[PDB]
Subunit: 419 residues, 4 copies
Amino acid sequence: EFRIAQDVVARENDRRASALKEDYEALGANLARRGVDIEAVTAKVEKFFVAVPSWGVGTGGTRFARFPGTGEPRGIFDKLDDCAVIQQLTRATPNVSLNIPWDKADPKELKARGDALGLGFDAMNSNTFSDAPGQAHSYKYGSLSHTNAATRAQAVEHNLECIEIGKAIGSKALTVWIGDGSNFPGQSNFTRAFERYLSAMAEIYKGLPDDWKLFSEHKMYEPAFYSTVVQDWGTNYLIAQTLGPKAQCLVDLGHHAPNTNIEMIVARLIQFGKLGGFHFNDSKYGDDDLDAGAIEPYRLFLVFNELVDAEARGVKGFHPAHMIDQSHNVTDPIESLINSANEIRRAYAQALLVDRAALSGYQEDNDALMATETLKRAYRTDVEPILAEARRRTGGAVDPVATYRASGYRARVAAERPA
Amino acid sequence: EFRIAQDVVARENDRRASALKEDYEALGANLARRGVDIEAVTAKVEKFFVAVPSWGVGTGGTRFARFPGTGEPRGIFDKLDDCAVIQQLTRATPNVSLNIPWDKADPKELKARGDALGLGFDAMNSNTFSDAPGQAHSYKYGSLSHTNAATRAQAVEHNLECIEIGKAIGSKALTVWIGDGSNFPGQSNFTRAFERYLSAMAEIYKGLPDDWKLFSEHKMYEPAFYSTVVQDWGTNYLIAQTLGPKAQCLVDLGHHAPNTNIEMIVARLIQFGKLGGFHFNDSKYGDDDLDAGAIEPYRLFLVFNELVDAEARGVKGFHPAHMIDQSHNVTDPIESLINSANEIRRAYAQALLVDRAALSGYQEDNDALMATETLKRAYRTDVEPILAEARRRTGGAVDPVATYRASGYRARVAAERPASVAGGGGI
Amino acid sequence: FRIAQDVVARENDRRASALKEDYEALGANLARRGVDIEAVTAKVEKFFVAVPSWGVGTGGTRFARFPGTGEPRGIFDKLDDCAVIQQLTRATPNVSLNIPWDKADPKELKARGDALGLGFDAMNSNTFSDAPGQAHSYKYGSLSHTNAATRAQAVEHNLECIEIGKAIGSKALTVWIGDGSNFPGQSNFTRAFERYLSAMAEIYKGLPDDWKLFSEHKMYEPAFYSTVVQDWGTNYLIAQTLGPKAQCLVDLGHHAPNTNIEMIVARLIQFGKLGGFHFNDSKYGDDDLDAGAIEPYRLFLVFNELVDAEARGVKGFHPAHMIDQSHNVTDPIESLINSANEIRRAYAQALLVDRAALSGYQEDNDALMATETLKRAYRTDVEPILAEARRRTGGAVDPVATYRASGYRARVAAERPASVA
Amino acid sequence: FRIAQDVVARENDRRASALKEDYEALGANLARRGVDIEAVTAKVEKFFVAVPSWGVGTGGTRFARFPGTGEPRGIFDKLDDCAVIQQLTRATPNVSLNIPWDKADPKELKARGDALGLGFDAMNSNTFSDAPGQAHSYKYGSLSHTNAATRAQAVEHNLECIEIGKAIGSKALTVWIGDGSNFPGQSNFTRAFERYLSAMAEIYKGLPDDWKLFSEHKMYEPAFYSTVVQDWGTNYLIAQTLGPKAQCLVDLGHHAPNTNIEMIVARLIQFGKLGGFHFNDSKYGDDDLDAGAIEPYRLFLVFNELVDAEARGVKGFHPAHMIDQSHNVTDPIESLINSANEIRRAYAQALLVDRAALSGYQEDNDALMATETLKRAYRTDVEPILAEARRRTGGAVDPVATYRASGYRARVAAERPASVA
Ligand SMILES: C[C@@H]1O[C@@H](O)[C@H](O)[C@H](O)[C@H]1O
Ligand SMILES: C[C@@H]1O[C@@H](O)[C@H](O)[C@H](O)[C@H]1O
Ligand SMILES: C[C@@H]1O[C@@H](O)[C@H](O)[C@H](O)[C@H]1O
Ligand SMILES: C[C@@H]1O[C@@H](O)[C@H](O)[C@H](O)[C@H]1O
Ligand SMILES: C[C@@H]1O[C@H](O)[C@H](O)[C@H](O)[C@H]1O
Ligand SMILES: C[C@@H]1O[C@H](O)[C@H](O)[C@H](O)[C@H]1O
Ligand SMILES: C[C@H](O)[C@H](O)[C@@H](O)[C@@H](O)C=O
Ligand SMILES: C[C@H](O)[C@H](O)[C@@H](O)[C@@H](O)C=O
Ligand SMILES: C[C@H](O)[C@H](O)[C@@H](O)[C@@H](O)C=O
Ligand SMILES: [Mn+2]
Ligand SMILES: [Mn+2]
Ligand SMILES: [Mn+2]
Ligand SMILES: [Mn+2]
Ligand SMILES: [Mn+2]
Ligand SMILES: [Mn+2]
Ligand SMILES: [Mn+2]
Ligand SMILES: [Mn+2]
Ligand SMILES: [Mn+2]
Ligand SMILES: [Mn+2]
C-alpha cells in the first residue's frame, strides 16, 4: 500500500524531471572528466539504507516543555504508518528501530503491519532508564549496574524480553543504552559499578542468539551529571572485548566531549573490529539530537570518509548498522527524518567520490595541503542530482519534502488522530 | 509554626555541643594568630541569606525520566511548608522564589502562609517557556521574541501579571528567563529576534514599580540547541543597558560555555553596575543544576571572592539578589537545599577570611604565587564550626541534615501527601 | 612579476576547457534558481582580504618550529612573497604589518609595496613580547600593567605604530595583548581592566580623523587563568567606552568551545562595533589553521551574517577582513592562497542565498525550509566562479598548481640563506 | 646543602610554636573522628613525586618567554636547583630527565645527583623537536612517520634513552610524541597508528626485565586536527598490545573539556595499565599550571581513586608520580615547591576518607551522605600534617618562606649570566 498517492509522486516528479536531467548530465560529465562513472556512484547510493527511530516519529521535547504538532502518532502502529511515508519517498529507510516498552504490542501484529507497509525492523532498543507502571524495582539509582541484585536481575530479564520480541519481528541485534551513573562525587564507586555492569551484560550475552549482535552505547553525560558507567569509547571497547565476538560498540555522534575527534574513534574501533554501528544526528552543544548534517556537514562527511577507506584498505566482514537517533522539537518529524536520511546519503556519496589513489600518494609524501584538498574536491561536489536520481529510479520522490507537503499527508492524519 | 519539633532541634544540638565548642575555640585561636576575630566573621555569616526555589523542593527530572520520592509537595502551599524546614534548620533561606503560573494562588493566602511560616518572597519568575491550558498562542517558536505580534503581547501580559502578584506579596523584582532561540541555522534572524525581544522587554519595564528591578537571565543553550536570544553576559549587558536603571543581569553559574571564567563576568557586571544577582548551583558538563559546590567548591569560593572584594572596597549601592536554582533528581530535595545553602555560606565565610591588604600588596608587586596563596590560606580554612555556631545562635541546627533525618519529617509528609508515580521527562 | 606571466598563461590555457564546461553548467543551474552568475562573479572579484606578514614564514608551537626552505629574511622578502599570493589569487592586495617585527624605513616599505602592487591594511602593535633596549618588561602585562611607566611605554609603542601606518597608507591600528593572569588572585580583574581602559584612551587620542582602533578579544593564551580582553562582552565595553573610532575585531579561533560565533558577529553589527575579522579555522583552541579546512559551514554562516547586514541596509558597514594564521606543516604561500580562496568561497555561497525565500520561512517559523534555503546555497560548488574571477583579473585558474609549476619556492630557497643561530 | 642548615633551623624555630598548636588541634579533631594523626603523617612522609628537569627554568609560550634572574642553563645548574626543592619539601627526591636536552656523561650525572641527594625517575625521550645534525626531520612525525628511516631514527633515539637511564638508576621510559595531523586527510588514522605500534614494539624489545614503558596520550598540540595517541582509549590499546611492561601515563591537562579524569584513572587501574601521572592544573587546555592552583577538588578526587585502589588490594598498582609543569610568571623553584605540597595535600586528605562509611552510603544509594563523606576529608586543613612531615624529615615548616629568607635566587643570579643585564 502507499501512504502517499502514486499520482502525487508521479506529478511532482514530472514537474522536476527536466531540471534533474540537466543537473544529472552536467554532474555526470564533470565526474567523467575526473575519471569517475556517475552510474557506479548512483548504484551504490541506491543501496545505502539507514534505520529510522520509532521514538523520533512523534514530536520530541526537553525537560522544560513539549510542544506537540498536529496528528501526533498515538502509538507504534501510527508511527509505523508515518515511517512508511519516509521510506516511500526517500527509499533510504526500509527498516525501523523499536524501543520496549515504548513500542510494546503483539509482535505478530507488528510484523504483519511492517510487511504490509514495506518496512522491516532493525536493532531492538531496551529501556531501563525510565520506570513503567507496576514495575517492581525502580531504576532511579541505576539498572544493569544498580547496587541491588534484584534490580539488576530485573533489568537483565527486560533485555531478554526485548530479544524475544525482536526474534518474532525479524530483528538481529540488541542495543543497550542505559543512564546509569552518578550525579555526585562518592555516590558511586567507579570500579564496582562497572564490575556490576559487566556481570549483568554477561548474562544478556549468554541469552543472545548466535545470529544476533549485542551493541553497547557510550555517552559522556545525561541523565547522569557527574559520572556515567559507559561514558566513552574506551570503556565501550573494554565492554565489547570482554563480552565476546558478538558484542560491539555503537557510536552516537552527539555523545562525545566538546571538540572530540569522532572520526578517529570510528577508525580505531574499525581497526580492532568493534565498530558495531552508528546513531546519526548533529549537535553544537551537547547531545542535541538535531537533524543529521544540519550543523556540521563536513564532520559527517569525514566520518563516512573513514567508512569508505575501510573498504578501500581491504577490511573484511565490516557491515556496521546505520541508524538515525534524533529528536524533532520544532519541525514536522517526518520532514526532518526525510532530510536527515538524505543528508546521510549525501555524505556517503561524497565519500565515494574521493580519489583514494591520489590521497594515498599525498599522505605518503606528507603533502598535507593537497591531501586535504583531495578530500575537499569530493566534499564540495553537489551530489543532490545523484540522490534525486537514485530516489526516482527506485520509486521515490525527486524532492521528498515538497512531495510530502503537496500530498497533504499531515492534514490527513491530523483529522484521523485526536488533538 | 515549627515544621521541626523544637525538642528535636535542642536534642540534636546538645548531642553535638561538646564537639562544636572544641572546634570553634580551636578555629578561634588559629584565626586569632592570623589577626582575625572569629566573632566578627560569625556575625556576618549569620546575616547572609539566599533565596530558595519553590520549584526546587520537589524532585526534578530529565527529558528521559523523573523518579519522584515520597511525600512530593502537591502545590505552592506544600512547597512553602517544606521551605520552612530549610529556613528553620539553616536560618540562611528566609525568602522563597515563586514561578507563575506554577505557583499561582490567592496572593492574600500566599502572604498569610509565608508570615505564619516565617518566610518572605524574593524575585518573581515568569514562565513563557511552556504552554499552559487555555493559552491562546503557543510558545513553541518563542515568546517575547516570537515573530507573531499577538504572541509577544500575550507574553508581555503574563509578565505584567507576575508583577501584580509580586506587588501583593512583598516581592521587589521580576526575573525573566526564556527559552527563545533556534535549533537550525537560518530558522531565526539573530538581529530581528533580538530587536523583537528588546521591544517586548521595554513594555514590561514600563510596568515596573519605582522600587522594583527587572532581571534578564542569559543561557548558552537548552531548550534551544543552535542559537539562543539571550545567550551570554554580553547580550545580557546590552539588554540591561538598553532597558534602563531598573534592569540588571542575573548570572546562573551553569549557563556558560565550557571553561568560561565566570568570576570575571561577575567582576565586569559589578564594575558597570549591572549585576542583579545570582542563581547558585554546580555543574560539570552543561546546565546540570547540581548542588552548589558539590563539584567545584573552589570556583564557588572564587565567585564569592569577587563579591566580598566589592563588599569590602565600599561598592555603594550593591545588594545582589542571591538565589539557589537547582534540580534534585537523586536526593531528598530538602536535604540538598539545606547543604547547598550551607555550602554557599561556606564560600562566603572563607572569602571573608582573605587578607585583603596582603592580597592588594601581592597584586601590586606582581607576586603571583603569594597572591594565589593568600586566597588559598582562606579557602583551606575549615569554617564549618563558624557555620554551625551561626546556626545554633540563631535558632538553627548544628547539623541540619542529621537533625532533619532525626525528626522523621519526610516520613510525616509522605503519609499526609498522595503517593507519586515515575514517568517520562518529555523526550 | 614574481611569477612569470607566460607560466600563468600556460597553466590557465591547460585548464580553460574544463573551466568553461563547469562555469557554464553552474550558470545554467543558477539561472534556474533566478540567480545571475555574472552578478555573483562581479562581486567575488572585488572581495579582498589582507594577508598577515607574520604568516608568510613557517610558524611553530612552544614545542618546536620546523622551517622549510627559502624562509623570508625580513619584511622585504615577506612582501615579495605576499606579491605572489596577490598575483595568483587577486584576493589579497593588502598586507598587515606587525611592529617591531616589520619595522623599517616607512618610505622604503611604501616603495616596495607600490612596486609590487600591494597596499597596507591595519597596523598591528606588539606588546606581548620584549624587544631589545626596552626599559620595562611586559612579562606581567603591558597596557594594563600595574606599573605606570610600563603602561606609558606600551602607549608610546602604539602611537609609534600609528605614525608608521600614516606614512605607508594604513588607516587603522589593531591592538591585541596577552595581558592577564595565570593564577587566581594574581590580578584584580576590575583594576586591571581600568588600567587598560586608561591606556587605550590615550592611544585613541592619537588617532587621525579617518582612522579606526580595533581591540581583539581572546579567551586564553598566553594567560591561562584570566585575560583582560577575554571575550566580545568585554570587547564591546571597550569600544563603547573609547568612542566612535573604536570597534571590535573578531578572530574566529578566540572563543570558548561550542560558542555561536556568527551570533556574536550579528550582535556587534547591530550595535555598530564590528570592526573586522581575523580569519582562520580551528578544532581545539586558537589553532590558527587554514580558513575553512576544518569547519567550512561555520565560515559560511559567518558570511551569511555579513551579507544579511547588507540586505538589511546597515549603513557605513565596511568591516576590515584579514587572515591571521600559522602555517606549521605546509608551504605558507600555498596555505595563504587556498585560505584566501576558501574565504571567497564562503562569501560567494552567502551571496547565493535566496533571502526573499528565507525571510518568508523565518516569518512563518518554517525552520526546516529556512535551514534548507541556506544549504541550497552552501552546497553549491562555486569553484568555477572563483576560478573565472581570477582568470579575468590576471590571476590563476588553479593558483597552487600554478605556484608549483613556477618553481618559485626552489628559486627563493637558493636566494635566501637559512638562519643558523 | 643548597640552603644553609642554619637558615632552615632558624625559620623552623620561628614557626615551631604555631605549628605545635595547629598540629595538636588537628590531632584532637581527627581523634574524635577515629583517626590517628601520627599514622597519617607517617604515610605523607613517604609520598614522593618526581620533579622535571625542564621545569626549574622559566617556561614560555609560542608568543614569548620572559626569563627571570639566575636561570639555570644545562642539566648541572638544573640539578642544583632541583636539590633546593627536595631539601625544603623532602617530597621530591628524584628528577625526571629529557634527552637530548639533559645529555651529559652518565657518570657525572650520577655523581652530581648523589652529591645533591637526588635520584633519577623515568627517562623522557624527545622526538617532537629536531636536534642539530639530525639525518631525518620530525616535522611530519617520528615513531609514526611515513618514512621508514625516520621511524628507525626515532626508535634508536629511544633505545639510547634506555641506555642512559640504565647507567643512572632509572627504571622506566616515558614516550610522548607530537605525531598527528593539522588537516583532515593529511594522515590515514589507522595506518599511522599501525606504524606507531610497530615502532613501539621495537622499543619494547630493548627494555630490561625490571623496566616499564609508559606511553602518554594528549588530545591536541602540537597537532591541531588529529593526534596518534589522542586519548586513554588509544593509550590502553597501545599498552595491551605491547605487553605487561607497557602501561599508560595520565597527564591531567591532556583531556577534552569537562572530561571525568578520575574515572579514567579508575578504569586504567582496573585493567592494570595505570603506569603513572603527570601532575599539573589547568582551566582551558594543556595550561601546565601549578598543581591544585585552579581545581583542588579534582586533584583530591584523583587521589581518592588512588587510595581506594590500595583499600581494595589492587594488584599491579605501583604508579609513578611526576610533576609536569611550565612556570611562566613565577620563580620556578617556588612553584614546584608549592605544587609538590599541593599533591601531598590531596594525598593526605584522601587518606582521611572514612572508607567504611563511604561504602555503606554507596550501597544504600545515599548520594548526599556519600558526597559529604568525601567532603569531610577534603575540607580538613591538613597543612599541619604537611608541615610536621617536613620538619621531621629535614625540611622546612614553610618552604617558600624559608626559600625567600635564604636568598637563594639572588645567589644563583650572581653566579649565572643572563642574556642581558
Ligand atoms: C558506509 C560503509 O562503507 C563501507 O565501509 C562498506 O560498504 C560498509 O558496508 C558501509 O556500511
Ligand atoms: C527545570 C527543572 O524542572 C523540573 O525538573 C524541576 O522543577 C526541577 O527542580 C527544575 O530544575
Ligand atoms: C575602590 C574601588 O577599587 C576597584 O574596585 C575599582 O578601581 C573601583 O573603581 C574603585 O572604586
Ligand atoms: C613545554 C614547555 O617548554 C618550555 O616552555 C619549558 O621547558 C616548560 O617547562 C615546558 O612545559
Ligand atoms: C614537554 C612535554 O610536553 C608534552 O605536552 C607532555 O606533557 C610530555 O609529558 C612533556 O615531556
Ligand atoms: C658554590 C657554588 O654554587 C653554585 O651554585 C654552583 O653549584 C657551583 O658549582 C658551586 O661551586
Ligand atoms: C531512545 C534511545 O535509547 C536513546 O536516544 C539512546 O540511544 C541515547 O541516544 C540516549 O541519549
Ligand atoms: C525555573 C527557572 O526559571 C529556570 O531554572 C531558569 O532560571 C533557568 O535556570 C533555566 O535554565
Ligand atoms: C600576530 C597577531 O597580533 C596575533 O595573531 C593576534 O592577532 C592574536 O590572534 C593572537 O593570538
Ligand atoms: Mn543513541
Ligand atoms: Mn566542531
Ligand atoms: Mn542520545
Ligand atoms: Mn536560573
Ligand atoms: Mn572546570
Ligand atoms: Mn538553568
Ligand atoms: Mn588574531
Ligand atoms: Mn590568535
Ligand atoms: Mn606530560
Ligand atoms: Mn603536556
